[PDB]
Paper text:
Pol α-primase is a constitutive heterotetramer composed of a dimeric primase ([name] and [name] in H. sapiens [human], Pri1 and Pri2 in budding yeast) and a dimeric DNA polymerase ([name] and [name] in human, Pol1 and Pol12 in budding yeast). During eukaryotic DNA replication, Pol α-primase generates primers at replication origins to start leading-strand synthesis and every few hundred nucleotides during discontinuous lagging-strand replication. Pol α-primase binds directly to the leading edge of the CMG ([name]-MCM-GINS) replicative helicase via a complex interaction network. The non-catalytic [name]/Pri2 subunit forms two interfaces with CMG that are critical for in vitro DNA replication and yeast cell growth. These interactions position the primase catalytic subunit [name]/Pri1 directly above the exit channel for lagging-strand template single-stranded DNA (ssDNA), revealing why priming occurs efficiently only on the lagging-strand template and elucidating a mechanism for Pol α-primase to overcome competition from RPA to initiate primer synthesis.
To examine this directly we determined the cryo-EM structure of a human replisome containing CMG, [name]-[name], [name], [name], Pol α-primase and a DNA replication fork with a 60 nt 5′ ssDNA flap. Similar to the yeast replisome, in addition to well resolved cryo-EM density for CMG, [name]-[name], and [name], poorly resolved density extended from the N-tier face of CMG atop [name]. The conformation of human Pol α-primase and its positioning in the replisome are remarkably similar to yeast, with the catalytic [name] subunit again positioned above the mouth of the lagging-strand template exit channel. Similar to yeast, POLA1exo-cat is invisible when CMG is bound to replication fork DNA but is visualized stably engaging Pol α-primase in reconstructions lacking DNA, where it adopts the conformation observed for apo human Pol α-primase. Human Pol α-primase is tethered directly to CMG via three small interfaces that are all occupied independently of DNA engagement state. [name] binds to [name] (site b) and GINS (site d) in an analogous manner to Pri2 in the budding yeast replisome, consistent with these binding sites being the most important for priming in yeast. The [name]:[name] interface involves charged residues on α4 and the α3-4 linker of the PRIM2NTD that form electrostatic contacts with four conserved residues on α1 of [name]. Binding of [name] to GINS is mediated by the N terminus of [name], with amino acids M1 and F3—invariant in Metazoa—projecting into a surface-exposed hydrophobic pocket on [name] in a comparable manner to Pri2-F2 in yeast. Continuous cryo-EM density links the last modeled residue of PRIM2Nterm (G5) and the first modeled residue of PRIM2NTD (Q17) indicating this interface spatially constrains the position of the PRIM2NTD and [name]. In addition to sites b and d, a flexibly tethered helix in [name] (residues 96–114) interacts with [name] and [name] (site g).
Numbering used by the authors:
A (entry chain A): 96 to 114, 170 to 598
B (entry chain G): 94 to 223
C (entry chain B): 1279 to 1445, 1448 to 1458
D (entry chain P): 1 to 5, 17 to 252
The structure:
Amino acid sequence: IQELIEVEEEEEILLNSYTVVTSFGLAQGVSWSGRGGAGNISLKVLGCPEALTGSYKSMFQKLPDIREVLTCKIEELGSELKEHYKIEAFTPLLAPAQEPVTLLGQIGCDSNGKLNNKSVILEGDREHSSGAQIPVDLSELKEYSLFPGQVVIMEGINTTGRKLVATKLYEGVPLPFYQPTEEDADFEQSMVLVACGPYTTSDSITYDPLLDLIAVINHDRPDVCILFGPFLDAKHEQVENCLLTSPFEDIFKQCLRTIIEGTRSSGSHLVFVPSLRDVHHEPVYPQPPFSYSDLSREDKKQVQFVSEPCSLSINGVIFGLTSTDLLFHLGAEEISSSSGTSDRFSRILKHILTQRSYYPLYPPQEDMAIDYESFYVYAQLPVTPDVLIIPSELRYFVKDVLGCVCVNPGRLTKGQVGGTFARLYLRRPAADGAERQSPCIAVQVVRI
Amino acid sequence: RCRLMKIEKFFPHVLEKEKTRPEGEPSSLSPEELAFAREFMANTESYLKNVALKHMPPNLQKVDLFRAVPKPDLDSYVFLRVRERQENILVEPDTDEQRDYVIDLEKGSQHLIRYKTIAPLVASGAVQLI
Amino acid sequence: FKCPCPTCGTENIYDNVFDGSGTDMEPSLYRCSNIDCKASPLTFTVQLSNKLIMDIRRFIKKYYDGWLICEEPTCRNRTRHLPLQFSRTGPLCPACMKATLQPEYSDKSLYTQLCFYRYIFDAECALEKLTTDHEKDKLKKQFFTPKVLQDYRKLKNTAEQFLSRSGEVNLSKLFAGC
Amino acid sequence: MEFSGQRNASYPHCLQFYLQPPSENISLIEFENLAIDRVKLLKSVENLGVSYVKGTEQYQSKLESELRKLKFSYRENLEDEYEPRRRDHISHFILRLAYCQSEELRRWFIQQEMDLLRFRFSILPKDKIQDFLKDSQLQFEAISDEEKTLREQEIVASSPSLSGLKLGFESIYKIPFADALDLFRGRKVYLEDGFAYVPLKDIVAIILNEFRAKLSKALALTARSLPAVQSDERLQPLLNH
């Protein structure tokens, strides 16, 4: 069609030449849009001891590596809490004690079932406890909240040297917050969009929620868009039955191409985070960034690919990123006697921030293939984030926990039907302030 | 005399550049040179129009001197001598990024290099052409 | 390896580059196992690569699930948790407290399985391993054209991506010997 | 005018002495075949021995064809022979473990190695000798070379084996009688006041001797230290058969 139109144009010319579901921070009434990324926006990835920039030697751990990882986490956070609480020493778990004694260890379960208040065990460090284990009774504690893999310090009675009567439980403590630069002061109010897969109804590869989200991005013109996998869900019906007529990787590249070419007119900057449900991508947590090549120079300046999990500085505001359903995983495994107003998701988020990790649960949940060395090297916080983005199949929420704005956008589809996404506003508080206030001033969750 | 040769040779380009110039940047033409250039432009166009173009078919009576007249060739090679030290100058052989590299210009040395890379240094007075 | 045919729904089983043996050798991707079906698996290699991705991910997941079992036959305790109380023969089991735990599906097992996945679609290697030139000529002239070899190579590459992500013998570790 | 604009360091010469461990990666089939082809070479050296006399031109001509066919290091080339050199290095480390299974097998492969080394040292041009003696620990400094003509007279009068031409083309340098041990104790040649007027081949004998000593220490280490590496040993029976 078009070629003939151009031929006819040449012929005519040549011839004629001779003639809202949830809100936070008093978000309502304010207009919701971005500057289309045209402001002084900046995106930088953080990590300690390093950031997850690329693939690693997976599938090849040995059990001493896993022992070392768990031991190092116990002793590192135990040393931090020892200094914080000014504790003198830790008694070995195997040592009998008629009076209360202070002990360092990690919470675990005596069997493969979900943790309960009778199946609790405490597993010690290598330095003081030689890695030993002891069963625990929590009923003498006035309050508690615990889960497997959690590093804790306890004081209790151990008359046999082989069972612990806990009398006090020392809480975990988060890292200090970030200290944004003068470049992070030379910026003005900005808007961030958050969305998480599947970007399809789980019965159809037609990517209708993706087109709806692209329309939302073009309509609102946000400054940054954080997009979490699955971009091609392993739990999708056509994917699971492997009926699709193109390779998973090509379909994923088409998905990214659809987002990038559809949203190029918005100007919005794009951040891409994987999920273990990304069928084309590595099935192992932590996942490295995606691999992609269709970018133009404008797209290269606007698009960035990051790991699962990831710590991202947005104009100096630290966003903690994990597509993993750690909320569902910890909800199935956390135990407590907190019968008061301490909400379940609040306790889970507090545990995430205090344990300084994007997956402190051990043993991991039944879908979570975890490489423990890469988890030790990449999945631990460099600083306490300002914003914690954590999607889940469980219902969306927004909460302020320990000074961090925790956001669960849900998922963009509830399997075969449409779901939710989220939007955030950033504005740094005045430099005269004596103490940190949240740089994230307002948040909302919206249906697709 | 030399400046006048260059004005006569590239008249549409120097005229258009001066017409475009933003405020605060120096001109390439003194006022008398600009007056001379404007006269030259008008005179040349008039001669061609009167001698041949009025007799052409109606669809061919216009021509664009901005397109017909060539442009200054900034890829020319030159010799030079430096009067102040300079650092991190990028040299591009060919035009494949895999061959790009950088050099430093020490005080009182002499070099042979393409004019396009050094053009800000000549305008700033850091180097001398010899 | 097992995968359903998109044309007739039967589940085809793959164990080699070839089906049959001797003079009756043929590509395992040549025709469907349903004798009444005309479909050729060389026409749905994309679906096979997709299923290969899912199955290899299942085996990698099985390795990373953390399952351990005790060595002692009177104990046989099964756990997903690694006890940090190690000994001269590894992690000491909490059920017996007399013998140690070992993985149910080890790294060497997963590496062997990934090599097997690579092998069953490594048409070039399989053709080179044939013992007579007659078989090589027949299989190349009748079936394994460059197009068919490229299809087999795409399935091979599907396995090779996971092998490249796996931890390849480290030469430096052999100097932990002598 | 003055203008402006990695594996060389690994093996500046085809000669190598296995001091540095190659701290990199390998494939299963790669280390397998790297070693097994050299097993064939070890047998082939002695098959050539039973064919005809050691080290003759017939030996030389056939032997280099074995190396070209078998893709291992050569008379030293200026193009990328560093790949054959590192293959030779890596495969040498791999070969330590197969025929350590018995001392007779150890001695067998050592003997064909000595024959191969003697051949390679026989091939050497002068520039190779000049740079390897300085680049290696095998220094063996020369002293007062102008006196060699007084020994051109004296050696010639005093030796059945040596001759005036050998003074120059088997270029003579001064080192002790003990570095010519078999020659002093057999009293075969002119040595005086405990010093020997020595060509390269005596230092080759010393190279072979210290190579044997270091290799024997390595074989003892192979017998002792190896069990942590022995997660797989399936090739060992096929190798000892």
